[PDB]
Design a protein around this nucleic acid. Structure first.
Length: 903
DNA sequence: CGCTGAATGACAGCCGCG
DNA sequence: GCGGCTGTCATTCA
């Protein structure tokens, strides 16, 4: 097989690497790597190395990586550029694997673990590990086994061995329902004392050292704990064995609210699944706890249990161990869905970087470009520092708050990457500048054409149209690879049909399947040989056909991630190819683009409607615009459509047959006006929305920028079974809005867009007569807890003290001197709730622990005093009032018209 | 931790007012 | 009392 690398590190003047060799064996090797950097030399010195600006360059092969850095610092002092790949690990990688890295994941040891640590004095600080580690479940992908390390005796208790038979039984039988899928894959090892367990674990860790290390919060908790527990008991020398190179570094990460520390295990790739989730799930969750995430993804969480975990080991050591096993398994299941691990490996090996680096857009791209410029003997610029200066971004239209009956939205494909290609924006293609007229002037096409020689951007930048830019070349490559791989998937779909005769005409001649590449559909070669094939081969063959169906996805979707991250890197100063002007070039071009087309779409709809000045585009945001299709539906007359679907098709047709063409003509002119290297401004009809035909619904409405709701029937050409509610910004998308309320608001909107004013009015009134009766906990809100220890004066409200941080305290006070009642904390979220006046509790409100009910020591009265009125008002009404005033609807009869005037 | 602007709205305070 | 700002704090579209 073709060998590859697992991990790489630089320790002193040597490169330590773990890797898979020609025969599948894992190997570790040290290398006295010789880095090569470059300096600008005299043109009269014929060579083969040039930078992205064509200037000739001389290679400087150093003795060791230190001289290399010594030179870089020396150069910086003199004031002359030091070109080349300074991250010697990256260079080492390009150099050792200059080719298409094909890895065999079944050889990559990916470990998933979780530990349990009984503590009665609160959350166990990892940087101290004051308490014993009483459990460790460490799943290993090579052995496909769960290794359980159970501590039978500790200062907190002595317990019996965990029973696997009991773990398998059902809940009603006193079991733990440990799934049958893994019941046979568990390897239980009980221990008499912690030291015996830790040492056996550490030994286990050498026999099977992880390459990829994951789990939930494993990098902020598990790893740091285990490391410090072991260090505090056996000394740092034994602790550093967790690293295959016996090297570890404490890394102190610090944010805008403080700091914590994680432990770097040289020779290991830590892809903590929580982080692997927060960055590839694309969706905000009100809680990122494994229980919350596991439920949201598999309709089931972590084992249930009675009492506080703090006492779960003692009172029920059986559940305790099972719990720890299910927690490790949940992660594995959540990854059986997301493939974020495979995604990572794939992305990392494509760019030839350290797997954990995929969390870094900058690093991934830096690496992909460096390998490209390397193949063509070019030398990358030298990273330089730049002030952190903000630049303008996307144009957002100030929508006129109102209901909007019929709406059609068009979007622009990969806006920014597209813009970079069309204008040819790169640092080495900057040709010059030009006097800049007000932006609107270019929007209205009444400004002296920038230049007839170079590709332009509304901010005054000009680019060469002959040269193919470094940045744009690279995106165009990824852009093609995508169509390429997602091209193989369109084929594996044609072979999944031809090879879809499991019982159609399965001949009875036992034969062997074929080696035809499903990437490329069949012709006659093997296409002919699909009949005489038995009913058995047909199935073993489609097993090899579908398998590729996903193969493309991994790469194609992985390319989509790349494409979409390029902008961020380009706008970040720590990027080798960053350029303030180029970033602004991009952003401003887009501002122009989106508004140029708004002018065009308006002008075009005004002619086809014989209207004058009418404003058809009602809202635009970055890469999309929404048009009011009212004036259109009216030419044809609303009373002439057989039903909802009739007018949807009418709009769908007018879109594809009339607007798109007018749109492309529009962008094609813009491309000429800016004298761009290539027209790439492509818009697509997106959604079509409106109320159900023959109903009193309003269809849609905007509250303001980033805040609207539509009733969509067809999206990008996919006619829904039932209309879909598309809501942006409104509180029903507010991860911080109660659930009972987040529901109504949703219902309220639906009744507004599809049923009408009387419907909304009948709901609202009921939701009031029955708000009390609603579960008392189905009301509280949500929010992050930052600087909690800033607005506390002896645990009291200080200056600018937020509304929750105050309740928090009238809770600490109502139960002061007690750790038997739910314990609060920071970085979390709490149930907030207003209390009437004259309440013996503390303030106007009172917050408390999330995911829990109020301790029966304050529960009884809290409810007795809670403010329902104030609660309904600020969480339900205020926002509805907001929706209905915009949509010009009343949620309550006898309301007065004048109330809408600002006099 | 990790990549960028553009914009909501909930609360806290100030100011200004016969 | 209460608009009319202003600046924090949180979250979300692009």
């Amino acid at each position: 097989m073709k060998e590859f690398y697992l991990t790489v590190e630089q320790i002193g003047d040597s490169i330590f690497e773990r890797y898979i060799d020609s025969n599948g064996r894992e190997r570790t090797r040290e290398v006295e790597y010789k880095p090569s950097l470059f300096a600008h030399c005299p043109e009269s010195q014929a060579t083969k190395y040039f930078d992205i600006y064509g200037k000739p360059c001389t290679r400087k092969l150093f003795a060791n990586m230190r001289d290399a850095s010594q030179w870089i610092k020396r150069m910086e002092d003199i004031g002359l550029e030091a070109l080349g790949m300074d991250d010697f690990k990256l260079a080492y990688l390009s150099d050792t694997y200059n080719y298409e890295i094909k890895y065999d994941h079944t050889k990559i040891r990916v470990a998933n673990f979780d530990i349990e640590v009984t503590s009665p004095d609160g959350f166990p600080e990892p940087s101290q590990a004051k308490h014993p580690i009483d459990a460790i479940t460490h799943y290993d992908s090579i052995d496909d086994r769960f290794y359980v390390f159970d501590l039978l005796n500790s200062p907190y208790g002595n317990v019996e061995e965990w029973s696997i038979e009991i773990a398998a039984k059902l809940q009603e039988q006193g079991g733990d329902e440990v799934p049958s899928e893994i019941i046979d894959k568990i390897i239980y090892m009980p221990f008499d004392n912690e030291k015996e367990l830790l040492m056996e674990y550490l030994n286990f860790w050498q026999q099977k050292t992880p390459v990829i290390l994951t789990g939930w919060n494993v990098e902020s908790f598990a790893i740091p704990y285990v490391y410090n527990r072991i260090k505090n008991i056996f000394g740092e020398s034994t602790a550093k064995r967790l690293s295959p190179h016996r090297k570890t570094r404490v890394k102190v990460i610090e944010n805008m609210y403080g700091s914590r520390e994680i432990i770097t295990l040289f020779g290991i790739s830590v892809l903590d699944y929580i982080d692997l989730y927060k960055k590839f799930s694309f969706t905000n969750q009100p809680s990122y706890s494994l229980d919350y995430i596991s439920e949201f993804e598999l309709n089931v969480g972590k084992l249930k249990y009675d009492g506080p975990i703090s006492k779960l080991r003692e009172s029920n050591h059986q559940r305790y161990i099972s719990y720890n096993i299910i927690a490790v398994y949940r992660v594995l299941q959540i990854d059986a869905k997301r493939q974020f691990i495979n995604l990572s490996l794939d992305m990392g090996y494509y760019a030839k970087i350290q797997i954990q680096s995929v969390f870094s857009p900058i690093k991934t791209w830096d690496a992909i470009i460096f390998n490209s410029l390397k193949e063509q003997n070019k030398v990358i610029p030298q990273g330089r520092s730049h002030p952190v200066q903000p630049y303008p971004g996307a144009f957002v239209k100030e929508p006129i708050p109102n209901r909007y009956k019929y709406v059609m939205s068009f979007d622009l494909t990969s806006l920014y990457p597209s813009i970079i290609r069309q204008v040819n924006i790169s640092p080495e293609t900057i040709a010059g500048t030009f006097k800049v007229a007000p932006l609107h002037d270019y929007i209205n096409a009444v400004a002296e054409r920038p230049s007839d020689v170079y590709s332009c951007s509304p901010n005054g930048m000009m680019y060469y149209k002959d040269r193919d830019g470094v940045v744009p070349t690279e995106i165009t490559k990824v852009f093609n690879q995508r169509k390429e791989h997602k091209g193989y998937m369109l084929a594996a779909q044609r072979n999944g049909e031809i090879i879809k005769e499991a019982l159609h005409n399965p001949n009875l001649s036992v034969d062997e399947p074929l080696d035809v590449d499903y990437r490329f559909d069949f012709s006659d070669e093997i296409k002919e040989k699909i009949k005489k094939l038995s009913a058995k081969s047909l199935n073993e063959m489609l097993f090899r056909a579908q398998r590729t169906e996903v193969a493309g996805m991994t790469a194609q979707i992985n390319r989509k991630l790349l494409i979409n991250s390029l902008y961020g890197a380009l706008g970040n100063v720590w990027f080798r190819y960053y350029d303030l002007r180029n970033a602004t070039a991009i952003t401003t071009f887009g501002q122009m683009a989106l508004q140029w087309i708004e002018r065009k779409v308006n002008e075009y709809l005004n002619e086809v409607c014989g209207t004058e000045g009418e404003a058809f585009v009602l809202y635009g945001d970055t890469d999309s615009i929404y048009v009011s299709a009212d004036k259109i539906i009216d030419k044809v007359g609303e009373s002439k459509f057989r039903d909802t679907n009739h007018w949807v098709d009418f709009l769908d047709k007018f879109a594809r047959e009339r607007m798109e063409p007018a749109i492309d003509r529009g962008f094609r002119e813009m491309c000429e006006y800016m004298n761009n290297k290539q027209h790439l401004m492509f818009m697509d009809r997106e959604a079509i929305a409106g109320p159900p035909l023959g109903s009193k619904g309003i269809g849609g409405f905007w509250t303001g920028k980033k805040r609207y709701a539509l009733n969509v029937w067809d999206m990008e050409g996919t006619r829904y079974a039932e209309p879909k509610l598309k809501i942006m910004g409104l509180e029903t998308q507010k991860s911080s809005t109660p659930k009972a309320v987040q529901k109504a608001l949703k219902e309220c909107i639906r009744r507004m867009l599809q049923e009408g004013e009387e419907s909304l009015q009948e709901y609202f009134k009921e939701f009031e007569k029955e708000f009390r009766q609603l579960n008392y906990i189905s009301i509280a809100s949500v929010s992050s807890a930052n600087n909690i220890a800033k607005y506390d004066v002896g645990g009291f409200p200080g200056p600018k003290c937020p509304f929750h941080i105050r309740g928090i305290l009238t809770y600490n006070r109502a139960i002061k001197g007690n750790i038997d009642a739910p314990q609060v904390v920071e970085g979390e979220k709490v149930y907030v709730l207003p209390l009437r006046e004259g309440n013996p509790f503390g303030d106007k409100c009172i917050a408390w622990p999330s995911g829990t009910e109020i301790t029966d020591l304050i529960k009884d009265d809290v409810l007795h005093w809670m403010d329902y009125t104030v609660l309904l008002e600020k969480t339900f009404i205020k926002p509805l009032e907001g929706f209905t005033s915009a949509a010009k609807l009343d949620y309550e009869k006898k309301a007065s018209l004048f109330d809408m005037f600002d006099f």
